[PDB]
Design an enzyme around this catalytic site. Sequence first.
Site, PDB file in Angstrom:
ATOM      1  N   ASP A  15      46.383 -40.854 -42.352  1.00 18.45           N
ATOM      2  CA  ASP A  15      45.496 -39.440 -41.758  1.00 18.45           C
ATOM      3  C   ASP A  15      45.658 -38.317 -43.033  1.00 18.45           C
ATOM      4  O   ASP A  15      45.104 -37.163 -42.603  1.00 18.45           O
ATOM      5  CB  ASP A  15      47.060 -38.991 -40.636  1.00 18.45           C
ATOM      6  N   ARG A  29      44.939 -33.071 -43.822  1.00 19.66           N
ATOM      7  CA  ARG A  29      44.981 -33.425 -42.723  1.00 19.66           C
ATOM      8  C   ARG A  29      44.324 -33.801 -41.566  1.00 19.66           C
ATOM      9  O   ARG A  29      43.277 -32.305 -41.547  1.00 19.66           O
ATOM     10  CB  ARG A  29      46.496 -33.299 -42.259  1.00 19.66           C
ATOM     11  N   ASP A  34      45.746 -39.928 -35.071  1.00 20.63           N
ATOM     12  CA  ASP A  34      47.083 -40.597 -36.002  1.00 20.63           C
ATOM     13  C   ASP A  34      47.442 -42.107 -36.280  1.00 20.63           C
ATOM     14  O   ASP A  34      46.641 -42.893 -35.067  1.00 20.63           O
ATOM     15  CB  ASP A  34      47.883 -40.059 -34.988  1.00 20.63           C
ATOM     16  N   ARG A  75      48.868 -28.148 -45.639  1.00 20.74           N
ATOM     17  CA  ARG A  75      48.304 -28.796 -45.078  1.00 20.74           C
ATOM     18  C   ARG A  75      46.857 -28.428 -43.975  1.00 20.74           C
ATOM     19  O   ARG A  75      46.497 -27.623 -43.257  1.00 20.74           O
ATOM     20  CB  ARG A  75      47.749 -30.291 -44.284  1.00 20.74           C
TER      21      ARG A  75
HETATM   22  C1  LIG Z   1      46.976 -33.108 -36.410  1.00 22.20           C
HETATM   23  C2  LIG Z   1      47.518 -32.066 -37.167  1.00 22.20           C
HETATM   24  C3  LIG Z   1      48.680 -31.928 -36.874  1.00 22.20           C
HETATM   25  N1  LIG Z   1      50.041 -30.935 -37.035  1.00 22.20           N
HETATM   26  C4  LIG Z   1      51.360 -30.679 -37.521  1.00 22.20           C
HETATM   27  C5  LIG Z   1      52.144 -31.281 -35.868  1.00 22.20           C
HETATM   28  C6  LIG Z   1      53.125 -32.814 -36.094  1.00 22.20           C
HETATM   29  O1  LIG Z   1      54.941 -31.344 -36.394  1.00 22.20           O
HETATM   30  P1  LIG Z   1      55.605 -32.922 -36.373  1.00 22.20           P
HETATM   31  O2  LIG Z   1      55.783 -32.832 -38.461  1.00 22.20           O
HETATM   32  O3  LIG Z   1      56.525 -31.375 -36.186  1.00 22.20           O
HETATM   33  O4  LIG Z   1      55.569 -33.190 -35.607  1.00 22.20           O
HETATM   34  C7  LIG Z   1      52.873 -32.842 -37.525  1.00 22.20           C
HETATM   35  C8  LIG Z   1      52.524 -34.500 -37.587  1.00 22.20           C
HETATM   36  O5  LIG Z   1      51.544 -34.776 -39.305  1.00 22.20           O
HETATM   37  P2  LIG Z   1      52.002 -36.500 -39.868  1.00 22.20           P
HETATM   38  O6  LIG Z   1      50.721 -37.722 -37.972  1.00 22.20           O
HETATM   39  O7  LIG Z   1      50.574 -36.894 -40.447  1.00 22.20           O
HETATM   40  O8  LIG Z   1      53.373 -36.209 -39.154  1.00 22.20           O
HETATM   41  O9  LIG Z   1      51.249 -31.715 -38.215  1.00 22.20           O
HETATM   42  C9  LIG Z   1      49.282 -29.996 -36.315  1.00 22.20           C
HETATM   43  O10 LIG Z   1      50.636 -28.848 -36.806  1.00 22.20           O
HETATM   44  N2  LIG Z   1      47.865 -29.582 -36.745  1.00 22.20           N
HETATM   45  C10 LIG Z   1      46.980 -30.800 -35.817  1.00 22.20           C
HETATM   46  O11 LIG Z   1      46.601 -30.497 -35.730  1.00 22.20           O
HETATM   47 CA   LIG Z   2      50.449 -39.519 -39.291  1.00 22.61          CA
END
Ligand SMILES: Cc1cn([C@H]2C[C@H](OP(=O)(O)O)[C@@H](COP(=O)(O)O)O2)c(=O)[nH]c1=O
Ligand SMILES: [Ca+2]
Length: 129
Positions: A15, A29, A34, A75
């Site tokens: 990811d 990211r 996911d 990110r």
């Molecule tokens: C894909 C994406 C993830 N995120 C955040 C939500 C998730 O928060 P939490 O860390 O609080 O779960 C985390 C998931 O990313 P990863 O799947 O890279 O961990 O990144 C966003 O805020 N916006 C997005 O578009």
């Molecule tokens: Ca992930």
Amino acid sequence: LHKEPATLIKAIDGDTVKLMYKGQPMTFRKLLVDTPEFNEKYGPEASAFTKKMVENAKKIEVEFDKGQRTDKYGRGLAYIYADGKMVNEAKVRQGLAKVAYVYKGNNTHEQLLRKAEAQAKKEKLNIWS
Ligand SMILES: Cc1cn([C@H]2C[C@H](OP(=O)(O)O)[C@@H](COP(=O)(O)O)O2)c(=O)[nH]c1=O
Ligand SMILES: [Ca+2]
């Protein structure tokens, strides 16, 4: 939405990817996806799929959506393209990622990705087998 140039610094995982964008190194990211972790079922192949696709590309591009361009972890949030082919889509189309994290501000390619996921699911590929 428009594509913009970048270069690969390093494939990180399913990811995330480190790219040079407007001349500054940035962790991106991937929007709307996911991917199983390396320890999970299909993890190894899911990262390798993603790694190859960015590493083999001669041209990497980035396409921001309309909403926020960076997440709470700093990110960059984009669709990533390798020689014109959307990495985010391609991962989902192989059954090696799921549509996820579809927030209201940044959902332009939702239905595109959901179709890819419905194809992989219909073919019972990988995470859908
Ligand atoms: C894909 C994406 C993830 N995120 C955040 C939500 C998730 O928060 P939490 O860390 O609080 O779960 C985390 C998931 O990313 P990863 O799947 O890279 O961990 O990144 C966003 O805020 N916006 C997005 O578009
Ligand atoms: Ca992930």
